[PDB]
Amino acid sequence: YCQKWLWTCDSKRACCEGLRCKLWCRKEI
């Protein structure tokens, strides 16, 4: 689900739940 976390969901894998695939995935609220 996640993308290595702190990595740009794409060349590795999609983004996790809540994360922001915009530019780079990362925890947020």
Side-chain angles (χ1 to χ4, degrees), residues 1-5 7-29:
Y1 285 67
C2 312
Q3 81 322 126
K4 216 215 89 202
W5 194 46
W7 159 257
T8 63
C9 35
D10 249 25
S11 227
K12 290 271 284 187
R13 33 247 243 271
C15 263
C16 240
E17 188 284 300
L19 259 37
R20 47 188 168 191
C21 197
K22 218 173 205 180
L23 213 186
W24 86 87
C25 261
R26 239 304 303 195
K27 244 291 221 172
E28 72 115 280
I29 187 123

Coordinates of all heavy atoms in Angstrom, one line a residue, unseen atoms left out:
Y1 N 0.8 -1.2 0.0 CA 0.0 0.0 0.0 C 0.9 1.3 0.0 O 0.8 2.1 -0.9 CB -0.9 0.0 1.2 CG -2.1 -0.9 1.1 CD1 -1.9 -2.3 1.1 CD2 -3.4 -0.5 1.0 CE1 -3.0 -3.2 1.0 CE2 -4.5 -1.3 0.9 CZ -4.2 -2.7 0.9 OH -5.3 -3.6 0.7
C2 N 1.7 1.4 1.0 CA 2.6 2.5 1.1 C 3.6 2.5 0.0 O 3.6 1.7 -0.9 CB 3.3 2.5 2.5 SG 2.2 2.2 3.9
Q3 N 4.5 3.5 0.0 CA 5.6 3.6 -1.0 C 6.9 3.9 -0.3 O 7.6 4.9 -0.6 CB 5.2 4.8 -1.9 CG 5.6 6.2 -1.4 CD 5.3 6.3 0.1 OE1 6.2 6.7 0.9 NE2 4.1 6.0 0.5
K4 N 7.4 3.0 0.5 CA 8.6 3.1 1.2 C 8.6 4.1 2.3 O 9.5 4.2 3.1 CB 9.7 3.4 0.2 CG 11.1 2.7 0.5 CD 12.2 3.6 0.1 CE 12.6 4.5 1.3 NZ 13.4 5.7 0.8
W5 N 7.5 5.0 2.3 CA 7.4 6.0 3.3 C 8.5 7.1 3.1 O 9.7 6.8 3.1 CB 7.4 5.4 4.7 CG 7.0 6.4 5.7 CD1 5.8 7.2 5.7 CD2 7.6 6.7 7.0 NE1 5.7 7.9 6.8 CE2 6.8 7.6 7.6 CE3 8.8 6.2 7.6 CZ2 7.2 8.1 8.9 CZ3 9.1 6.7 8.8 CH2 8.3 7.7 9.5
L6 N 8.0 8.4 3.0 CA 8.9 9.5 2.6 C 9.4 9.4 1.1 O 10.2 10.3 0.7 CB 10.0 9.5 3.7 CG 10.7 10.9 3.9
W7 N 8.9 8.4 0.4 CA 9.3 8.3 -1.0 C 8.2 8.6 -1.9 O 7.0 8.6 -1.6 CB 9.8 6.9 -1.3 CG 9.7 6.5 -2.7 CD1 8.8 5.7 -3.3 CD2 10.7 6.9 -3.8 NE1 9.1 5.5 -4.7 CE2 10.2 6.3 -5.0 CE3 11.8 7.6 -3.8 CZ2 10.9 6.4 -6.2 CZ3 12.5 7.8 -5.0 CH2 12.0 7.2 -6.2
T8 N 8.5 9.0 -3.2 CA 7.5 9.4 -4.2 C 6.8 8.1 -4.8 O 7.3 7.5 -5.7 CB 8.1 10.2 -5.3 OG1 9.0 9.4 -6.0 CG2 8.7 11.5 -4.8
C9 N 5.6 7.8 -4.2 CA 4.8 6.7 -4.7 C 4.8 6.5 -6.2 O 4.1 7.4 -6.8 CB 3.4 6.9 -4.3 SG 2.9 8.7 -4.3
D10 N 5.5 5.6 -6.8 CA 5.5 5.4 -8.3 C 6.6 4.4 -8.7 O 6.2 3.3 -9.1 CB 5.9 6.8 -8.9 CG 4.7 7.4 -9.6 OD1 3.5 7.0 -9.3 OD2 4.9 8.2 -10.6
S11 N 7.8 4.8 -8.7 CA 8.9 3.9 -9.1 C 9.1 2.8 -8.1 O 9.9 1.8 -8.3 CB 10.2 4.7 -9.2 OG 10.9 4.3 -10.4
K12 N 8.4 2.9 -6.9 CA 8.5 1.9 -5.9 C 7.1 1.2 -5.7 O 7.0 0.0 -5.8 CB 8.9 2.5 -4.6 CG 10.4 2.9 -4.6 CD 11.3 1.8 -4.2 CE 11.3 1.6 -2.7 NZ 12.3 0.6 -2.2
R13 N 6.1 2.0 -5.4 CA 4.7 1.5 -5.2 C 3.8 2.6 -4.9 O 4.2 3.8 -4.6 CB 4.7 0.5 -4.1 CG 5.8 0.8 -3.0 CD 6.8 -0.3 -2.9 NE 6.9 -1.0 -1.7 CZ 7.6 -0.6 -0.6 NH1 8.3 0.5 -0.7 NH2 7.5 -1.3 0.5
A14 N 2.5 2.3 -4.9 CA 1.5 3.3 -4.6 C 1.6 3.9 -3.2 O 2.4 3.4 -2.4 CB 0.1 2.7 -4.8
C15 N 0.8 4.8 -2.8 CA 0.7 5.4 -1.5 C -0.2 4.8 -0.5 O -1.3 4.2 -0.9 CB 0.5 6.9 -1.5 SG 2.1 7.4 -1.4
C16 N 0.2 5.0 0.8 CA -0.7 4.3 1.8 C -1.9 5.1 2.1 O -2.2 6.1 1.3 CB 0.1 4.2 3.1 SG 0.3 2.5 3.7
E17 N -2.8 4.7 3.0 CA -4.0 5.4 3.4 C -3.6 6.7 4.1 O -2.8 6.7 5.1 CB -4.9 4.5 4.3 CG -6.3 5.0 4.6 CD -6.2 6.1 5.7 OE1 -5.8 5.8 6.8 OE2 -6.7 7.2 5.5
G18 N -4.1 7.8 3.7 CA -3.9 9.1 4.3 C -2.8 9.9 3.7 O -2.8 11.1 3.5
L19 N -1.7 9.2 3.4 CA -0.5 9.8 2.8 C -0.9 10.7 1.6 O -2.0 10.6 1.1 CB 0.5 8.7 2.3 CG 1.7 8.4 3.2 CD1 1.3 8.6 4.7 CD2 2.3 7.1 2.9
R20 N 0.1 11.5 1.1 CA -0.2 12.4 0.0 C 0.8 12.1 -1.1 O 1.9 12.5 -1.1 CB 0.0 13.8 0.5 CG 1.2 14.1 1.3 CD 1.3 15.5 1.9 NE 2.3 15.7 2.9 CZ 2.4 16.7 3.7 NH1 1.5 17.7 3.6 NH2 3.4 16.8 4.6
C21 N 0.2 11.4 -2.1 CA 1.0 11.0 -3.3 C 1.4 12.2 -4.2 O 2.2 12.1 -5.1 CB 0.2 9.9 -4.1 SG 1.2 8.9 -5.2
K22 N 0.9 13.4 -3.8 CA 1.3 14.6 -4.4 C 2.8 14.9 -4.2 O 3.1 15.3 -3.1 CB 0.4 15.8 -3.9 CG 0.0 16.8 -5.0 CD -1.0 17.8 -4.4 CE -1.8 18.4 -5.5 NZ -2.8 19.4 -5.0
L23 N 3.6 14.8 -5.2 CA 5.0 15.1 -5.1 C 5.7 14.0 -4.4 O 6.6 13.3 -5.0 CB 5.2 16.4 -4.4 CG 6.4 17.2 -4.8 CD1 6.6 18.5 -3.9 CD2 7.7 16.4 -4.8
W24 N 5.3 13.8 -3.1 CA 5.9 12.7 -2.3 C 5.0 12.3 -1.2 O 4.3 13.1 -0.6 CB 7.3 13.2 -1.7 CG 7.1 13.9 -0.5 CD1 7.1 13.4 0.8 CD2 7.0 15.3 -0.3 NE1 6.9 14.4 1.7 CE2 6.8 15.6 1.1 CE3 6.9 16.4 -1.2 CZ2 6.7 16.9 1.6 CZ3 6.8 17.7 -0.7 CH2 6.7 17.9 0.7
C25 N 5.0 11.0 -0.9 CA 4.1 10.5 0.1 C 4.7 10.6 1.5 O 5.9 10.3 1.7 CB 3.7 9.1 -0.1 SG 2.1 9.2 -0.8
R26 N 3.8 11.0 2.4 CA 4.3 11.3 3.7 C 3.1 11.5 4.7 O 2.0 11.9 4.2 CB 5.1 12.6 3.8 CG 6.5 12.3 4.3 CD 6.5 11.7 5.7 NE 5.7 12.5 6.7 CZ 5.8 12.4 8.0 NH1 6.5 11.4 8.5 NH2 5.1 13.2 8.8
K27 N 3.3 11.1 5.9 CA 2.2 11.3 6.9 C 1.7 12.7 7.0 O 2.5 13.6 6.9 CB 2.7 10.8 8.3 CG 2.0 9.6 8.8 CD 0.5 9.9 9.2 CE 0.1 9.2 10.5 NZ -1.2 9.6 10.9
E28 N 0.4 12.8 7.2 CA -0.2 14.2 7.3 C -1.7 14.1 7.8 O -2.2 13.0 7.9 CB -0.2 14.9 6.0 CG -1.2 14.3 5.0 CD -2.3 15.3 4.6 OE1 -3.2 15.4 5.4 OE2 -2.1 15.9 3.5
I29 N -2.2 15.2 8.2 CA -3.6 15.2 8.7 C -4.2 16.6 8.5 O -3.6 17.5 7.9 CB -3.7 14.9 10.2 CG1 -5.1 14.8 10.7 CG2 -2.9 16.0 11.0 CD1 -5.4 13.5 11.3

